Design a binder for this molecule. Structure first.
Ligand SMILES: Nc1ncnc2c1ncn2[C@@H]1O[C@H](COP(=O)(O)OP(=O)(O)NP(=O)(O)O)[C@@H](O)[C@H]1O
Ligand SMILES: Nc1ncnc2c1ncn2[C@@H]1O[C@H](COP(=O)(O)OP(=O)(O)NP(=O)(O)O)[C@@H](O)[C@H]1O
Ligand SMILES: CC(=O)N[C@@H]1[C@@H](O)[C@H](O)[C@@H](CO)O[C@@H]1O
Ligand SMILES: CC(=O)N[C@@H]1[C@@H](O)[C@H](O)[C@@H](CO)O[C@@H]1O
Ligand SMILES: [K+]
Ligand SMILES: [K+]
Ligand SMILES: [Zn+2]
Ligand SMILES: [Zn+2]
Ligand SMILES: [Zn+2]
Ligand SMILES: [Zn+2]
Lengths: 306, 304
């Protein structure tokens, strides 16, 4: 026999990452399919197929854990996921439990990330861990004494949907600051500023060209004027926003994930720029890059069923 | 009314860009690559052209960089890492669906073209653009002009077999021999790419980790990952030393996912000399200056 198999999905805007882990917790499968962006029936299909295939291949019924960028309504189970249009408003858990004849756990992407990063032997005994995702959106996962705080309505750590603080607006020219609309339908949420997408939007706003983050960073590495100006502004903006968040949460460790966590300058600049914006007696948290690379989401989702 | 569209089609991701008459990027989209249904593949491309046509109210020129070769006679595609597109007349099919001319070019050639026209490289006698992603791809530029070859196969370094010194590193008759999408086997495409980096890890350690994950473990100093990275760095130096003995490029520009692994830029210059000829001098080895946009830019400016 094969034993218990744990399946994890990390659902994003573009790609669904799948992982299967055996009883030893060793990853034995890794697939990536296109996230069906129009039909929800197609969305369901994509997920169902991967579960079945893997069930066949390993000859088991694996447990199913899913990490999604948004919130499963704590009462109705309906999903609020701006970046996955196909799934917006659907009862994803119910629908899948039907189609796959077993329990399904759904969890926020950033919570899964934080859970997996925090269960590492190096962080497992930390009093608190903040998992921060900087990708298409800005997402937070709050772990206190090794346990996820998911909150009264599964919204804990939705730092991306808090509005720009005053000191950040002042950096961006106050009444002349760009006010970006948000997928949540509010306006000026940090989701659209500190994410990789936001990094891009901020560049475009000041310079009228739609470059990608890697492209801007490359220009910055070459010392190009616009990119140097952008990076300076963005590093200060990131320090201001995170200083606000750390004044509220005061986490012991902060772990960065998502695409923009690849920008190495972040790890050198944050420790330098944070002190000015924190309280005089604050001490910096340990700020580190994800220890599980891009797999924390999948791992965290799969181990919900541990 | 002049708008230039460029596509960079990869194993995982389709990148799209629109550039105005001033060559300023004014659009940027990124879809997953539909790699099973060719009808879906065609759809993805067609959608992005149309959307952009609507939004800007123009019909843009269309340039596409694909990871593989359009048969110089039949136009049928050989795309080793996209089962979907394999065998189809992509250019013909799209010219139909989009009622205008389409230029197709190899992804690595587009990348190299864009990287070579940078003011910093403009007068270099030769430039090798190297993509390390789902596959291994090369673009050869001599005196600022692309060499695409007798049948569009120039720079297909990914479909050359492991050299003897690389096989020796990996245990000779015990070395993993990976099958290739081209249907040969032992092609470097499956060893030096990000995918190959992963497959090599899995082969020695029996766990399906992603490259970023392996690198993270390496950064933490984990035993297996440190062993893997040492092996992989040596393997990369051996294979590239072989290729540079043939090509002797002035500049090598790295692109694709695995070009983000910073250790490469520190390790290659240290490890290459032992495997090159005694009087070899290292080329200038640099990370892509246009980040992940080289391919899109190159493709769009074919129609320039
Ligand atoms: N290596 C990189 N360096 C800098 N920015 C990057 C890098 N990779 C991706 N990005 C940017 O990160 C953004 C996409 O982040 P990504 O984390 O891939 O999003 P996602 O997959 O949609 N969601 P999720 O995985 O849950 O965070 C885009 O703005 C990219 O340009
Ligand atoms: N930041 C990174 N560090 C290391 N490996 C990476 C990184 N980003 C992506 N990869 C790896 O790169 C491979 C995918 O190549 P990538 O270039 O991202 O996509 P692609 O469109 O399939 N290929 P390409 O032909 O280069 O455009 C996978 O093995 C990824 O794990
Ligand atoms: C309401 C909503 O869509 N929020 C999501 C959040 O759940 C996620 O963690 C973050 C990063 O992916 O992106 C968005 O902010
Ligand atoms: C025959 C074939 O499909 N070769 C492709 C090559 O064209 C491409 O440049 C490289 C990098 O994407 O991947 C593959 O090796
Ligand atoms: K959360
Ligand atoms: K080529
Ligand atoms: Zn919001
Ligand atoms: Zn890991
Ligand atoms: Zn081959
Ligand atoms: Zn550029």
């Amino acid at each position: 026999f094969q034993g218990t198999m744990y399946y994890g999905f990390d659902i994003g805007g573009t790609k669904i990452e799948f992982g299967a882990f055996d009883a030893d917790l060793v990853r034995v499968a890794r697939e990536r399919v296109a996230t069906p962006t129009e039909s929800y029936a197609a969305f369901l299909d994509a997920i169902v197929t991967l579960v079945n295939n893997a069930d066949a291949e390993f000859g088991v019924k694996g447990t199913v854990g899913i990490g999604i960028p948004g919130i499963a309504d704590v009462e109705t189970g309906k999903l609020l996921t701006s970046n996955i249009p196909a799934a917006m408003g659907h009862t994803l858990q119910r629908d899948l439990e039907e189609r796959l004849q077993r329990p399904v756990k759904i969890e926020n992407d950033a919570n899964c990330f934080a859970l997996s990063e925090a269960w590492d032997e190096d962080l497992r005994g930390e009093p608190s861990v903040l998992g921060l995702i900087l990708g298409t959106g800005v997402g937070g996962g709050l772990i206190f004494n090794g346990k996820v705080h998911s909150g009264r309505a599964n919204i804990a750590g939705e730092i991306g949907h808090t509005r720009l603080p005053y000191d950040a607006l002042k950096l961006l020219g106050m009444e002349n600051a760009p006010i970006f609309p948000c997928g949540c339908k509010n306006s000026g949420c940090i989701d659209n500023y500190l994410s990789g997408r936001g990094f891009e939007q901020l560049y475009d706003h000041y310079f009228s060209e739609k470059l990608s983050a890697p492209e801007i960073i490359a220009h910055y590495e070459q010392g190009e004027r616009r990119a140097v100006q952008h990076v300076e502004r963005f590093m200060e903006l990131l320090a201001i926003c995170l200083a606000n968040i750390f004044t509220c949460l005061d986490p012991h460790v902060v772990v960065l994930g998502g695409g923009l966590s690849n920008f190495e300058l972040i790890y050198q600049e944050l420790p330098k720029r944070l002190p000015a914006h924190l309280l005089h007696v604050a001490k910096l948290p340990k700020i580190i890059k994800a220890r599980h690379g891009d797999a924390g989401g999948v791992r965290g989702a799969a181990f919900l069923n541990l």
